[PDB]
Amino acid sequence: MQKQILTSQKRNMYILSRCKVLVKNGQVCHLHEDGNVYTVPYANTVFIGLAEGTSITNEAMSMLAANGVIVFWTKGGGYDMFAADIICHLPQADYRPTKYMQNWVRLWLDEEKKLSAAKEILKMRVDSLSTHVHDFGVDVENKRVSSIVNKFDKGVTQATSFESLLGHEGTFVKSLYKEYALEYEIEFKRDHKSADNYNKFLTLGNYYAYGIARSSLWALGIDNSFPLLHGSTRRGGLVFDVADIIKTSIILPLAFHAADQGMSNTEFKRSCVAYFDKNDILAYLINNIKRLCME
Amino acid sequence: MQKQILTSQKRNMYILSRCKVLVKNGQVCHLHEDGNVYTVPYANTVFIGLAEGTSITNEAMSMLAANGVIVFWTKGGGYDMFAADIICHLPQADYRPTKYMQNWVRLWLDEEKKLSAAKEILKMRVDSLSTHVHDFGVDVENKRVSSIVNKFDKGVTQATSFESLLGHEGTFVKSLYKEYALEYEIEFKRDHKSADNYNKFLTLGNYYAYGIARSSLWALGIDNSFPLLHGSTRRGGLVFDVADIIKTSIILPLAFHAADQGMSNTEFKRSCVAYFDKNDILAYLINNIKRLCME
Amino acid sequence: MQKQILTSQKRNMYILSRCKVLVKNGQVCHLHEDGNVYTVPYANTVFIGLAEGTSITNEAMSMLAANGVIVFWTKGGGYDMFAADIICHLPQADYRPTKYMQNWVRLWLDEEKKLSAAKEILKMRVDSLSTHVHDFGVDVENKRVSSIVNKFDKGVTQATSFESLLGHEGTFVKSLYKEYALEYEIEFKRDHKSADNYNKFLTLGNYYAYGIARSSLWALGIDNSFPLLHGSTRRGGLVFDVADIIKTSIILPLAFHAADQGMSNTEFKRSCVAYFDKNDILAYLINNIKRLCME
Amino acid sequence: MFIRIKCFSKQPIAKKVSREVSAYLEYTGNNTWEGHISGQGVSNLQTKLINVGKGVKVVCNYQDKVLFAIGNVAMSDTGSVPKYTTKKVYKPDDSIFTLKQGLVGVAALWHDLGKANSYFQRKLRGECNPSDPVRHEWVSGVIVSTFAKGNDWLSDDFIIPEVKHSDNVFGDDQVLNAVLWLINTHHKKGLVEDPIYRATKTMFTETLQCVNVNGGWFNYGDNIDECYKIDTSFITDTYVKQLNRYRKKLLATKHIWFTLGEDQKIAILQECRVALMLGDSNFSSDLIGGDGSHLYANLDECGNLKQTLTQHLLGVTDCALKALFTINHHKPVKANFIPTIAEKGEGKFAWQNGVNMVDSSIDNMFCINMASTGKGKTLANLKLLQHFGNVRCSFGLGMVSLTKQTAKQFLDMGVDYNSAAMVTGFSKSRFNLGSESLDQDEVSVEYWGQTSSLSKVFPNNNAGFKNKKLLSAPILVTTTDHLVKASGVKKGNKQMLPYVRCMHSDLVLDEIDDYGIEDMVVLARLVYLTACYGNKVIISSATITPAISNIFYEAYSSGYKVFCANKQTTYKGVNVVWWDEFGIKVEKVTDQFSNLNTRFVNKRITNLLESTPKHKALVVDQDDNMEAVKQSITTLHNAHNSGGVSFGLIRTTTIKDCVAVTQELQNWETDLSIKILCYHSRFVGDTKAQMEEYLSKVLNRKGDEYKKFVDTTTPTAYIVVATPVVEVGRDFDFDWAIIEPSSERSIVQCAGRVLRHRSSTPTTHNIHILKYPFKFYRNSNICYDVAGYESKGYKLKSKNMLDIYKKESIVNSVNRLQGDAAFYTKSLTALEHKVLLDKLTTDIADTNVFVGGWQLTANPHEYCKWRRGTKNEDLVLTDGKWSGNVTTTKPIQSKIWRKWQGENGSITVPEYLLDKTICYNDFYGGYEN
DNA sequence: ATCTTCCCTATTTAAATTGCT
DNA sequence: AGCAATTTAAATAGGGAAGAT
Ligand SMILES: [Mn+2]
């Protein structure tokens, strides 16, 4: 494996569905019931999600974890309404760098430093918006998005608690959900259990940003049991805290565009790889979480 | 095959080998090598392990995680785990780090509890030596070994700094190395690069010790970035610090016996996991970490 | 062959260099002087070209002609200023549509009608500029380009003789070539016997526009032997009017961009395919001669 | 258009497809081509890649979606191009496939035991009547029933016992009864004449016990004793071991048979019967040559003795087993990814982006497309089919010309003949004249296409042109009668081809309201059968009645229950997609369909009502409808005209009514310049077709091209007197219409023939409804039964349309969309809705839609007849000379605007009017004079 | 069970030669 | 000179069995 592609420099990501994942001739490959064995670039894979009807052997996990691939399952607590337990195995056989845990927990225990870090990660939402622009959807520089970003920053500046924070999240996300919906001419209510494409593509992008966020966390050694946002509806830990940096900048525009431009699940999945490697979002989140812990 | 490991008091770390785990008639079972299905009771197990030759499916994964049975992927033997998720307080109701984890963090932070816990980990390492008495190895009650034990006890009790504890730990470890070299009629000097039987057998036994200490640290949710003796820049130093407890008590006599009789590596693996299963070495490490972190 | 792809929707486009063009096992291909046999898609080829060291056979030429692929030979220029003579095999075995040739003849024989067609075709290059705007190079709607095409349109409106058209043709070519030179910050002189990349990329685009123009003329049955613009300098046939309608709109900015970015000739071949395919320049030329013929 | 073609092929079928795919694309190496080409280039590449032979393994990708997949190449489920491809994948408790295998194998080794009687031997040799007294399927059933009553029929030695004449062979054992029904109905289903049995029998065996020998098998019955004296020469090696292995297969799997539901048993036994006729006809079609003598089954074309009964039974068994395997394990060939569909709809097609609100991964879908006409309904149906992936559908439409219109839309938008197959099974002689080269129309019958793998299990490699177009079509744009035979037939093997067609393909039925009530019943039977195999039903009807939409949903729900419990999956419900031009709504509906459907209907009504009223109808007060037609023509010309020129449509009910209105209007003295056309259906091939093309080109009002097909310079009243042939499938736009009332859906449809293309609102009134139908003067007891849902069981208390309709009313689909069961005896709309819920009900009855227990019998194909019409004999005009009692006559030549002459063709005359001369005429076709 | 190595197993591609036009 | 028929042979794919963890 020589040096092994840095995990920020891995570009392939997969969520396999209705297959038996195994190893043939040393190959991570998923076999469907039609007799088709598709290989996976395991030394270049960021994550492999496993949907319903999936199965994986031991050796496939053995040479995915040796190559640093995070494997999660989309069922269990994967109904995304409670978002309690998306079953997500990490490769902890590799002994990770430690200093990001140290600076992360120094700021975690200190509640005032946790509050300030939460504000930085809430500002990372609008930072993501500005950095990652899309040319097939909402312009970030129009009056509504600039007004709501200004309102979000002036609310999160004067914030006092995590209950006040939970509320600012409600506003940003819900109103960005809505602002897209009115510009995409669709009455839209976010529902993880909804059948319309505007929600199934959104849940697929939720799993994709879950994988990117969890790979960015594990890269630095950061776990999930140390979240910055505490609330009643914020069950799920730090992986959703990192992942909702890039809902409204990446996952939500791609999902809305996909649904509006009638993409299929496969091409939305691919549009997600194209945006996650063209702008290098994994290295973005990894470097930005280094900025978050730092001292 | 089916293997039971007691870990804390009542929950059992099940290890499954050469079997296909799925859902039959609404509950999790597994077809084994002999073509006979075996079910699993949800009440008596929390950790379930997937050894070599083992595949699990998606709805089995989901129903296992919905019953509080949290799954990990391991190399065959049950003490070489490479893939898992993080223990919470409850798997479905909430997401909080375990009390053990938080206690460890707090103890590590304040300098006095970190020094006291470093002294305590070496106290229990001397306890481990006596507790796990071998047959082929040297007598722990022998006058030279007891003199080394009392020298280590005096040195740990009278020390006020970590580098003194590192020098004393190295003196104790290599003094036990010298004692076992005096037993087995050889000039033994500990180097990882040597290709002789004693050094490489001790190296792969140390890797087994790192694996079982990693399982013990994971099973209480203790993260791999808070070492007691080793430095903050040492990657996975807590695995090495916990494995130090059983490196000179269990791994060293088994490795020197293995190099004395000169048998091959797989049967040394089966001797190591037989000693782990017979005397509940993982349960000893689990109770050790509970007594360290609870204080 | 059912409905052979209408010539205007034929897409492939080559100039073959240092290879003998033959037929293997059914398909037309070209074999270079190292053993490499690359197939030609003759059913979708617009034209092929033959550079130095090329040699086509009989049944290959037949399979190109019966499918309707116009074939020329690039070399033959022997003067100091002019692309002298390009030898071009017309597929006349396909019997052509007739009344478009009758319309071209009824405008060619009447001198005032030829002058009127000369007028509209001189402003056709002006509207070509306006329609086909590249992303690189100059912007068409700047003050200098609009001033020179306005002076060109004002002068060609009041023109009454073909020698005045030739003079205004010369000032137009000098104006564009030099403005592109200014943009790309180079000194430019159009010599077909020059080693500078802005020149032989322009001769390669001369060959490309020649092939496009004979395919457009042959698609409506128009011969090269009816030049509506004629003179001492301008003696090439109708190909030197329907070929340089699209110099300063398509080829010359593409040639300057290819000589500015400076990779090999193959990126220029593929860029000519890409722009002649994306904007449908062949169908655009055919439809323009269509609205010429019936007016 | 940029495509990429990859080859999976072995042989030199990686070589002689390489010539064609290297004629159109550049070679990127490693048997992969990639390049730019046009859509017609894609069509040419398809046509010369499929025709080059069998074994072509080609996958094409346009951008990243798969364009096409030649063969049964697995290609892409998620990623594309597998690698270590293999066999052995899932191996489940398949259960019901083992059940179908055991039933088909056990029955197929027993399906022709009854040819061993001496009567069938002298029938094949030819010294007696070729029609048996009792059919050999019933004799074999008697053999199997007697063997089951004597010995244990599942695990014993066979030995054929001494059998007698039995009136019934059906007992109580559910599995034996399944085998007996498969044996007896391997040629035709039993027919039950009994009214009490038809009234009460519902279950599987409880209906099957009423299937006696008198239901078609017992022809005449004088040589019964010779028909039941039987030899036992079948006891050989391979027959006995095949019977033993299949009987034990059934023995091992019949434990899951009792865990099935009634719906399952019916659908599974229908599949078993279809596979059994497939194997039987496949082995009966080919000539095997060899024989072991002393017993025979079939005859060749020369009448010689061939196909001895032991190897005939063995061949029918293996062919039916192979039929079952290929029909139960097929990944069928789907259509191309049409690139002109997937982009956005613009303007009035902007509602077609409702497919971006539907899930692309749903296994089932029940679309109710309530969008109005002119919005591109069929294009939206194709868009909905392509939203889930590649398309495999059967566009079943009424009329030949509507299938032609949908085919022409499919051709000019994006679909070639490698994916589309227009099927009209009559070979009409309506050709396009003027210019063959400058046509750019007249969609024809070629189907370059791709032959499916199911053709090898059909008799004699399916058939020639027609059945190859039926079975192998990815998209089958067909007349509907090539699909309604899937639910079952009286006599023969005509069920299997639409059955196997609808098994692996979706079903798209457009404007189902124009069909008859029994036609809609058998269409919802087809919907249930299509949903039985997980395919998706798209219904596209704007004027849907809740009753219809409900019973079609319930048919789809019973079918999806069959499909859900067939694959041992828990039934979550049906993905219902309500759709119109104002929105879409996708809900997982397992119950409470009625409130959601009526809420969508009310939302569509409120989205129709705030728009401007386009059809204001006034019911006239003038009793006599002749002079009511006169006064209404004068009034609506004086109110609705385009500079003195107006177009009127006199919609009447029947043909002699049409010629009565025409002959009155021609003799009507007025200052108006009336120019009269007759537009009914009784016309000769030439004349009729000519009327169609003229009317379609003069009533086109999207542009002013019609000003040149009529004399619009002089103020003229262009009047078209027509029967209900104008209100179905005609893209006509009249300035105004005068309607003889027959049904309310006729009112809504003839409102749709007025201002269909324009958007200008009428000021006063554009429809004048007559006071009475003309049958009031002929039958005052019942007058609306002709072209209406009035009948002898549903009689209006009053026939006055002031009593049964609003005097001033904005006519739209709202009255049909709402649904009212109360006051059906004195309003037309509630009369309509009543009948629709009282015939298409959620019962099984015998002529109903949930039919269970009777699918086993021939009853739903006899008492519910698709296109039930009158006797209908055809008087044929041959070169100007008529055949029967026709007598050409001369029309009134007063106001005829256009009259086309005819020389060939045929007219369809009911047997009632055959008694007298139909008196064919050049202007108006058939009448009573 | 999973996966690997190896032995059939023959099925499957590539080259080679050579009259024939 | 391209091709076709037709041999000849090298290699590719797969299935079964046995040995490892
Ligand atoms: Mn028969």
Ligand SMILES: [Mn+2]
């Ligand atoms: Mn038969």
